[PDB]
Design a binder for this molecule. Sequence first.
Ligand code: E35
Length: 470
Amino acid sequence: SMSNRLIFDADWLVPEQVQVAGQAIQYYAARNIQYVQHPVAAIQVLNVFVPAAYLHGSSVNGYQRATAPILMPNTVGGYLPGPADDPQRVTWPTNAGTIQQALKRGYVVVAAGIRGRTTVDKSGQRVGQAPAFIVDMKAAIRYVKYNQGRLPGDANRIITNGTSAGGATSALAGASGNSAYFEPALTALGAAPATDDIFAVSAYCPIHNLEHADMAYEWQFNGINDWHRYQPVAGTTKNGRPKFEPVSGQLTVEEQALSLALKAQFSTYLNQLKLTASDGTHLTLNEAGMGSFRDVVRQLLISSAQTAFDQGTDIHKYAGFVVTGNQVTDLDLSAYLKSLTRMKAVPAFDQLDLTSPENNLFGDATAKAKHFTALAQTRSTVTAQLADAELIQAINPLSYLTTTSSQVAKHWRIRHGAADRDTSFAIPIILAIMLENHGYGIDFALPWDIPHSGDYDLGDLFSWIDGLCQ
Ligand SMILES: CCOC(=O)c1cc(O)cc(O)c1
């Protein structure tokens, strides 16, 4: 209610500890903070964790109470609700380990609870579909920045982090700072009267650019007709990890047809982006999906393999790589992709029967699911509606990156595993290049043999953060 003044009190912080790397790490915690005046869902709370030194006037890793970076991780996966995280949390989903390490590194951590596609209110109406996820992320950022100087850490040094859907969430927060589009939603929530532009973005395999992901996916996996992924089983746990029974299928001629068309459409979309290499040349693809852009994808995978090769890794686990002496000199991209295997069917994202997580994301209180591409809407196998064009645009990080804006985060670090088949490599690569082209700092790589995951290189993530903030 309006009784919630959204004023943080350091007095709320109580002492706790956790074991990390053979050491006891002491911190303080304030949990279950209602970060808007008018929440519609119980998940809309945030947890604050603070290195103990900052409540004793002291330093960690060159940081103080006033100057510490504020890492704002989220637990969003599959565009599902993301509960407020906790270094003590053991139930799925959680990046508790990351919080532990971050506190050890001297970062303030603000772990916000985020609505997702399955979230219902008191009446049982859906209130977590798009753009609830980013609205909540922004509202939590606004709470932190409103409470600058009351809350430990530098609110001008907010660094978001997330994996997959959560990576898109993090990238979107960095891209869309102070966007007028989200103002009516934030106002109706009673979010804090402050800005939501952030300092830096960490994103692991950001599942974004959803309206172009089907085209990118088929550009990559066309010619490969068997798909291999995972699906629900159960068994009672102690901490709710939803378990994955395998299922594989075989592309129908209808599917193959869509695939070939989708692949072709990707050339057109890609070319109109006017992406440039650092030499300044237009990155392109021809009608068959070959060209300088494909060569860039190939070079990043080659770079990935070389790093692994130099560490004694057997890169021939996958097919396609040419090694000449001590150098990965070339790559048969098609052979590699076939050895990697296709994961999703066709379309990969905007399914014709509205059964994808992204279909459900684009639903509303009235519609459980919607299409978000013209092709899937035209070829729908169920009665369906197209999601609003402005909404699709609003939750795509790329929409904001057509210029150097002061509202866009200046510092970006993006990773997508070289064994991650959940979206085309082209998707994070486009994001990476567009950032570079427009003058933003961008640290990008496709880490060797890394599956759909995140937070696996914390030592390098934290080194990157420290390079920015100290
Ligand atoms: C399975 C967890 O990762 C996700 O967040 C995710 C989200 C998507 O929209 C699609 C996907 O393959 C994974």
